Every structure is written in C-alpha cells, then in structure tokens.
Structure 1
Amino acid sequence: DFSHVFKEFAARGDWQRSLRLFKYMQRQIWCKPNEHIYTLMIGILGREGLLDKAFEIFDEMPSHSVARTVFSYTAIINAYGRNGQYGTSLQLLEKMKQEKIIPSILTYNTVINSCARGGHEWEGLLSLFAEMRHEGIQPDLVTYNTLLSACSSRGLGDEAEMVFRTMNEAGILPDVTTYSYLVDTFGKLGKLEKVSELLMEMEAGGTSPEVTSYNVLLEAYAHSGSMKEAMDVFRQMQTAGCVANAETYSVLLNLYGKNGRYDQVRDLFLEMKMSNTEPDADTYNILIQVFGEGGYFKEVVTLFHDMVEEKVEPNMETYEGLIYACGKG
C-alpha cells in the first residue's frame, strides 16, 4: 500500500508529501521502508530535479540497512544522463563495475543514450557497445531502436550508413522506429537511394509503413529536390495505404507549387477532399498561395465560398491572401 501511494503521488508530482511520508516511515518500526520504496522515492526526486535529495536518500540506505541494487545505479545513471552529464554516468557505471554489480541491458542502453545526448565521440559509443557485447548483454527491441539511433547521433556518413544497415544487414529490423531514425541519419549525409529503401524496408516488412513516417521522409525528400522521387514516394505513400491526414498531401503540394502543374494541384485536391480529410487552415492557405502565384483569381474567390461551406474557420494569413487575390484581380 505504501508503494502504491508513492506511485500515485509520483503520478501527480507530490514529491513533498512523498518525502514527508518516507521520512515519517523511516522512524516507524512497523512501516520501515524497503528497497522498492527507496527506489520509488529516488525516482520521484529525480523527476522533479531534486538530485541532492535523491543522493541523500540513496546514501542514507546503508545507515537504514537497505539493500542496494542495479536498479538504483541505473536510476542514478538515467538521472545524470537526462541533464547531459555523460561523464557522471560513465563514472557511476565504472563505480558499479568496481562494486561487483553486474550491469544490465537497460543500464547499458541508458549509458549509451546519455553518451549520445551529451555529445560523446562515436568511438566511445562503439567501445561501450563492444564492452557490453563482451560482457554478454542481451538485445532488446527498444534497445535496438535506440541503437539504430546511436550511429545517427554521431552523424558520421559511415555511421549513418551503418545505422540504417544495422537493421537490414543482420536481418532483424523494428517495423517503424528503427526505420525512421535511420532514415533521419541517412538524410543528412544523403540517402541516395536510401530514401526509397527506407519506405520499402518498413512497408513490406509485414507492417504497413506509417503515414507520419512516410511524411517525415517525404518532407526532407522535398528539401532534397526529390520531386519525381517524392512523387513516386507520394504514389508510394499512396501504395502504403496507411490512413493519412491531408497534412501529408499539403506538404508535398507546397513543393509542387513551384512545379506548378496547376492541374496536378487540381487533381490531388479532389481526392483528399472527398477522403474525409478536409483541407486544413494550413492547406487552404497553401492552396490559395499556390493558385495565386499562377493566377486564377476568380478561383481564389471561389475558395472563399467553399471554405465557408466547409465551416473550417479562416486565419490571419488566410484572410490575407484572399484579399491580395482580390486586389490583383
């Protein structure tokens, strides 16, 4: 019941009441706090940024005859990493190793994440992974997603290629998360064909590729000047079949504005429109801008009749262009 109350207080952020209850139970013989209550209090203190109080509570454990477990070490490592203290996490890992405490897969993953977020060299992450492998750590799906990122965090071109291939070459791939992060890394270096691959890898895996996923790659794909590739990616996203908010179309259309087929614009509109994905305040503004640059001002007026009927409300930029249209008209 004490642990349940502590968890409920940590869910609401009542660190003060939890600390008071812990300090009161510490003086009670019938309610002596155990290692679980100490870990819960340390986590509650770390969630609020009370590193000093958490450290004091962790140090008072031996005076209270409370057992210490890798759990507390992993919690301290995660608390240090959340503030960018990668060196402190490495020192805590070394101290735990000196204390004959066998590190777990979660502790190694937390240390790798802390090193990645703190700006440590990719060589350090590779050495940490090699050490974890030499001490027989166990792979996990969540760890694998964060591991695909490890190379991405480094940002090296070779690392970016390895980040993506880590899943493909060994033959084990997370359906969505690994593909997204690897695609992100592939992009800065330049996913030359890695872009087609990233969607293909996620899609035929046995899980249909995510729409948001299709879009994130797609948006950069536009930055890439990928147009036929992105169009193909759009027909490909169309192949994906994942339900998509008109926002995914919106982004691509905006690039297509420079393309200005102007009937390409027309066609896409009908389909997203009748697909229960009414154009967004954003999409309407984009459409007005795209049409306006290439004329069709009468059409611009028409969009006003249309927006009103839809009942989606206008916005500052929205009203604005509509007036420019009138003016040029």
Structure 2
Amino acid sequence: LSPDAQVLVLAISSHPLPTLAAFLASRRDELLRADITSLLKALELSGHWEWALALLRWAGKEGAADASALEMVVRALGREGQHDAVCALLDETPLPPGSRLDVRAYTTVLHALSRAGRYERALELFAELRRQGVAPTLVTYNVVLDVYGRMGRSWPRIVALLDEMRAAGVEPDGFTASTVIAACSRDGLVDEAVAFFEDLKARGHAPCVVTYNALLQVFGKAEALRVLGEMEQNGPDAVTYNELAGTYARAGFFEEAARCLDTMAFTYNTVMTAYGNVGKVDEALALFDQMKKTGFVPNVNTYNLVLGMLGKKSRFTVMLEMLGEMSRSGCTPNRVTWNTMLAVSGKRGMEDYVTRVLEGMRSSGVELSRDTYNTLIAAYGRCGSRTNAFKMYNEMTSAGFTPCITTYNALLNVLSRQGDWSTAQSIVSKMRTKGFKPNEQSYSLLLQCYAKGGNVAGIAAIENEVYVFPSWVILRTLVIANFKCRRLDGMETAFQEVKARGYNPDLVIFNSMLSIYAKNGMYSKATEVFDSIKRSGLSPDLITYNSLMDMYAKCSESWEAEKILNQLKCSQTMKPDVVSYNTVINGFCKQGLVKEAQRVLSEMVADGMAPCAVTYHTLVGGYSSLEMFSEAREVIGYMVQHGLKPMELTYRRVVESYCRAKRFEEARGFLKALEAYIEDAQF
C-alpha cells in the first residue's frame, strides 16, 4: 500500500528474529501511526508469518493490537499449523480489555489447545466464548466434541452439546459422526455408540468410510462379525483395513473370521497382512488357500506380499512351495520376488534355502544383474556361508560386473563374524585401488574383525585415522572393540570423546566401562560409573549388577558383593543368575574365605537355582589355594557324581597346587601333559 509502509515491512522481514523487538521499539512512533493489520498482512503474504507474530506481540505490549490484528495472525498460524504459537497468544494475550474475536479464530485456538492436550483450557475458552455472545459454528462444535472425546468420560456433556447445537439449528456432519464414535471408542461406550449411528440413520444422513472405520474401531478394542460386514456392503476399505490389523492382536480367533469372510482382493490381502505382521502366517496361508479355493487368481503382487510375510518368519520350505505354484500357474516371478525370497530374516538352515532360490533364479533365465549378485552375497552373508558368498563374488566379477561398495561391505560382513582381519585388510586395500573409498560401515566391520582377531594394531591404527570423522557408531564400536581386547587406553580414550561430542551413551558403554575397571586396577571410577548410569536416569542391568559384584570381588570386599546379590533377590525384577552366584563365590574363594563360599552355594541351590561346572570349579580353586586338597577332591566328585563334567583347568589348578605342596605321588595318584608337568617339577 503505502510506499513508506512497504519500506517498513521490507525492513522488518529482513531483520533477524532475536533482535527484532529492540528494533520495533526504535520505530515505535513510526509503527503506531500505521496500520499494523496491514503490516501483519503484508508480512504474512511475503511468507513471514513469524515476523507478524513478533509484531503482534510487540503491539499488544503497546496497546495497538486489536481483534483484527490477532485474528489475522491466528488464521495464518493454523493454516501453517503452529498450534504452539496459537496457544501462546492465548496465554499471553496481546489484547486490550474488551476484545472479542471472530468465531473462526476462537475455533482455531480451541483446536490448538486440543492439539496440546489442554482440554481443560479449551472448555474454559468455549464457555467464555458463548457468554460473550459468539455463535459457534459446525467446526467449533466438532472441535469441542473432540475435546470431550479425548478428555474422556464426558459422554453426557456430548449429549448436552449435540442438543445445544441442534436446538440452535446446526445440523451435524461427518466430522461430527466420526468424532463422536471415536469418543465412545475411547471409553468403551459400545452400547451408546451404535444407538447413536442408528439414530443418525433416522434423521437421514449418508453413511461413510471414515464413519465405519470409527465404528469398526469401537468393536475393535471393544462384534466385528455382523458389524464389519455391513460396513462393506453398505457401500472403501482404506484405513478401515488397518483397523483389522490390530483387531486381531487384541483378540484371538481364526474360525470366526474364516466363517465370516466365507459368507461374504485388497480386502483379502488386508486380512492376510493382519495375520503375518503379528506373527500368524499360518493363519494367513489358510486365508490364502481359501481365497484361491474361490475363483480368485492371485497375481505376482499378491504372492510377493505373502512371500514377504512368510519371509519375516523364515518359513523357507513354503516360500519355495509358493515359488512353485507361481511359475506353474503362469505367474512369473519378477525382480521383486527374488528380492523378497532373499530378504529373509536369518535362521538356521538358510543356506540351502538361498541355494535353492538361486537354482530356480538361474533355471528360469533371469540374467543376474550386478545388484542381484550383491543381494545374493548378502544372503549367504546372513547365514554365514563365507564359502558361498565368495563363490558369488567370484562368479560376479568373472562375468564382468564391477563390484561396488555394497559388494565389498557384504564380504566384509562375513569375515567380521569370524574375526578374519587378514582377509578383511585385503578386501579394503583392493577396494581402494579400484577407486572405492571405505565408508563408515566398512570401518565398523573392520573394527570388529580386529577385535575378534585380538589385533590391537589395526584397532589403534584406525583410532588414529579417526581421532575419518568419529560418528556415534564408530565411537561406540570402538569402546566395545577395545573391551574384547580388554584395552583400557582405547576404551577410556574414546569414552570421553563420546561425551565431548554430545552423545548420550547407552548401557552398553556404561556396562563395558564398569568392568574394564572392576577386573583392572581402578575401582572407583567404577563407582563413578554406577553413579553416572543412575544420575543419567538409566536403569541398571543384571549384567551391570553382575559386573558390579566382580568389582567388589576383585577388591577383596566380598560380603558387599553378597549384599548386591541378596538385594537382587528382592528386586522383584532382577533375579540373580548363576553368574551372580559364581562371581560372589569367586570372590570369597579369592580371599581364602571358603566356608562362606560354600554357604552361598547352599543358598544357591536352596533358592532353586542350579550350580554348574564353573561354579564347582571356583571352589576347587579356592580349596587348592590353602592346600586342603581333600575337600577339593570331594568337590570334583560332586560334579561328576552329578555329571557336571569338570574342566582341565579344574585339574590343572590342583596338579599345579599339588606340585607346590611337596606332594608328588599325590598329584600322580589323584590323576596327559599334566603328568608331564609333575615330571618337570618333581625333579
């Protein structure tokens, strides 16, 4: 409008937001003389809804904001969807005393509070709304009914409002019906929901899709029998389908739905999906058969769906069967099919399956692409068939395809399992000359080959090159990788770096840290950790609790470890673990305290737990220590007398202790290379 005002507006929309108020002040008099409403509008067209906001708040604090000013911002805020801002204009009103608003605007604020769970404020506002003589509209009504619906237990107030609205001649719509039914749905008002819809009929009213889904939902968590039926034939399965997907989980039946559906594709596929995503594939395959059994001829896309849900259950045998019915019915498998048959969540016996998929994948033409081979490598990688992954890697290249980074990472996954790093290094080095530079994943997979290789070299060699941006994964992978190698420098090093970069560490790191102190020479940072893990608000684990006991055990303070064990007995959620029992027994044994140690073994059994090899092994050590070899020999009996099968270390610890005690023929009688240990000892 005004050239002076256009300059002012441009000057406002260009100014940063944090400084703007100190700026608007400087132009106080300049602003007051103008039409803010016109500035707000101009600041809204230009796409700067947040600058008008600032202006409004400024003017309210000055007295130059009117209803129309506010009403303009609000309409902008709701179309833009900034409920928070709406709610704040209401909590810090830029309005002068009198001040009444347009209906549309009040209903936008009501929706904003609703959107925030401030149902109690919405109702306060609604009351204030009609005591100022504002005629609410259909949308205002529907918004308020929604407030009542999510606030809960407000059915009577809903009856009241429906009355009030009709008595003022505002007939309900579809947003009114669904809103209401979902309200009954959230309160278990099954009975009164139906009487409602069936009253909607009376007064006239065309039924709907969203309606039925709401009604559906009622009987859902609440009947889906004679009900869900109507919804169909009444008239289209859109969202209504999903409702079936959770209908099954909150209940339990396979006969009614078969008996129902019988009586009657997507619709079919929907119900099948409902079964296979909650883990009822046996239930879906039956739905599939029934479906086939009645005319219906599935296409490749229906098979890919069934195979897809069978796949998450690793039902190899029937996936191949389905693969059969396809190709022998015309339904030629597509790319999506093989990818589906190869994206199986790994189980035991996956290799031969994969092998059979590949056999039909190549006995049916289908030229394997580059990505196809990568998919086939990943598959044998899941199983762990290094042998078959690499045969695929070799067949690949030998056919002229060029391996990508996805192909190298695949192979790298494998070796990682087996901690074969000497082969990993070769992969990496190969990929570099080919031009391919390792990514983050490629590194984590290296860190894991090394750790299972006990190669600290390659570990610290990467630590260097990273300290390779250190991502939360890499730093977390490094903390672990060092713990397998039990490396305190490395672990600690990158521990604080995880904090200095604004990452929140999980119980894994904390647990891993606590123990690299317990079994080491630090026993206070440990206490720091168990105080940090808590101060952090995290819930300690048994493993955490067990690692804890090991600390006290190594600090020669065992009863305290016994306390934590006992305290676990009440935990009501924790519940010891022979490890916890073992760990405590190991400590007492380590301090010469062995009666106390078998006293906890007695509890152990009494509690109905189950002593094991390692458990007995501990005592034999602690007995051998203070040379009292008879009570020790009595133990190994117990193990075997109960068939617990001792360990050569159980024997060694006695042999080596029988040697040092000047008793040689004893070491001999009692009793491989061990006897040899006595010979090189005796003389």
Q: Superposed, which structure 2 residues align to 1:95-110 within 5 Å? A: 95-97=360-362, 99-104=364-369, 107-110=372-375
TM-score scaled by length of structure 1:
0.69
**1:218 CA displacement:** 3.1
Which residue matches 1:66?
A: 331
Q: Which amino acid aligns with 2:453?
A: L
Larger relative contact order (CA 8 Å, sep ≥ 6): 1
1: distance between equivalents of 2:523 and 2:367?
Answer: 64
1: distance between equivalents of 2:545 and 2:277?
Answer: 41
2: distance between equivalents of 1:50 and 1:122?
Answer: 22
Q: Superposed, which structure 2 residues align to 1:87-126 within 5 Å? A: 89-90=354-355, 92-93=357-358, 95-97=360-362, 99-104=364-369, 107-116=372-381, 117-120=384-387, 123-126=390-393
Q: In 2 relative to 1, CA 191–166 (structure 1 residues): closer, same or farther, beyond 3 Å?
A: farther
Q: Which amino acid aligns with 1:152?
A: S
Q: In 2 relative to 1, CA 248–56 (structure 1 residues): closer, same or farther, beyond 3 Å?
A: closer
Which of 433, 444, 453 is residue 180 of structure 1 equivalent to? 444
Q: In 2 relative to 1, CA 49–276 (structure 1 residues): closer, same or farther, beyond 3 Å?
A: closer
Contact kept in structure 2, 1:163 and 1:182, CA below 8 Å: no
Q: Superposed, which structure 2 residues align to 1:201-280 within 5 Å? A: 205=469, 207-209=471-473, 212-222=476-486, 226-265=487-526, 271-277=532-538, 280=541
Q: Which amino acid aligns with 2:509?
A: T
Q: In 2 relative to 1, CA 197–166 (structure 1 residues): closer, same or farther, beyond 3 Å?
A: farther
Moved more, 228-237 or 268-277: 268-277
Which residue matches 1:127?
A: 394
2: distance between equivalents of 1:154 and 1:288?
Answer: 31
Q: Secondary structure at the match of 1:64?
A: coil
2: distance between equivalents of 1:81 and 1:278?
Answer: 31
Contact kept in structure 2, 1:151 and 1:160, CA below 8 Å: yes
Which residue matches 1:37?
A: 302
Which residue matches 1:294?
A: 555
1: distance between equivalents of 2:510 and 2:517?
Answer: 10
Which residue matches 2:270?
A: 4
**1:278 CA displacement:** 6.4
Q: Which amino acid aligns with 2:387?
A: H
Contact kept in structure 1, 2:479 and 2:494, CA below 8 Å: no
Q: Deviations over 1:55-75 (max 9, x none)?
A: 443333355332332333344
Q: Which amino acid aligns with 2:517?
A: Y
Question: Structure 1 stretches of 5 or more lacking a match?
Answer: none
Contact kept in structure 2, 1:43 and 1:75, CA below 8 Å: yes
Q: In 2 relative to 1, CA 314–4 (structure 1 residues): closer, same or farther, beyond 3 Å?
A: closer
**1:36 CA displacement:** 0.9
2: distance between equivalents of 1:296 and 1:45?
Answer: 54
Q: Deviations over 1:50-109 (max 9, x none)?
A: 555444433333553323323333444556985546466456436534533133455423
Contact kept in structure 2, 1:246 and 1:277, CA below 8 Å: yes
Which of 144, 148, 152 is residue 412 of structure 2 equivalent to? 148
TM-score scaled by length of structure 2:
0.38
Q: Which amino acid aligns with 2:298?
A: P
Which of 450, 457, 464 is residue 193 of structure 1 equivalent to? 457
1: distance between equivalents of 2:270 and 2:465?
Answer: 43
Q: Deviations over 1:262-283 (max 9, x none)?
A: 4444555555554444655544
**1:20 CA displacement:** 3.8
Contact kept in structure 2, 1:26 and 1:32, CA below 8 Å: yes
Q: In 2 relative to 1, CA 231–137 (structure 1 residues): closer, same or farther, beyond 3 Å?
A: closer
2: distance between equivalents of 1:239 and 1:17?
Answer: 52
**1:48 CA displacement:** 5.2
Which residue matches 1:15?
A: 281
**1:19 CA displacement:** 3.1
Q: In 2 relative to 1, CA 185–253 (structure 1 residues): closer, same or farther, beyond 3 Å?
A: same
Q: In 2 relative to 1, CA 278–104 (structure 1 residues): closer, same or farther, beyond 3 Å?
A: same
Q: Secondary structure at the match of 2:447?
A: helix
Q: In 2 relative to 1, CA 297–167 (structure 1 residues): closer, same or farther, beyond 3 Å?
A: same
Q: Which amino acid aligns with 2:422?
A: D
2: distance between equivalents of 1:274 and 1:15?
Answer: 44
1: distance between equivalents of 2:534 and 2:475?
Answer: 17
1: distance between equivalents of 2:464 and 2:413?
Answer: 19
Q: In 2 relative to 1, CA 163–8 (structure 1 residues): closer, same or farther, beyond 3 Å?
A: farther
Question: Structure 2 stretches of 5 or more lacking a match?
Answer: 1-265, 598-683
**1:259 CA displacement:** 3.2
1: distance between equivalents of 2:278 and 2:481?
Answer: 37
Q: Secondary structure at the match of 1:255?
A: helix
Contact kept in structure 2, 1:35 and 1:67, CA below 8 Å: yes
2: distance between equivalents of 1:25 and 1:313?
Answer: 46
2: distance between equivalents of 1:266 and 1:17?
Answer: 52
Q: Which amino acid aligns with 1:185?
A: C
Q: Which amino acid aligns with 1:251?
A: S
Q: Which amino acid aligns with 2:511?
A: S
Contact kept in structure 2, 1:104 and 1:137, CA below 8 Å: no
Question: Between Structure 1 and Structure 2, whose CA radius of gyration is higher?
Answer: 2
Q: In 2 relative to 1, CA 39–276 (structure 1 residues): closer, same or farther, beyond 3 Å?
A: closer
Q: Which amino acid aligns with 1:61?
A: M
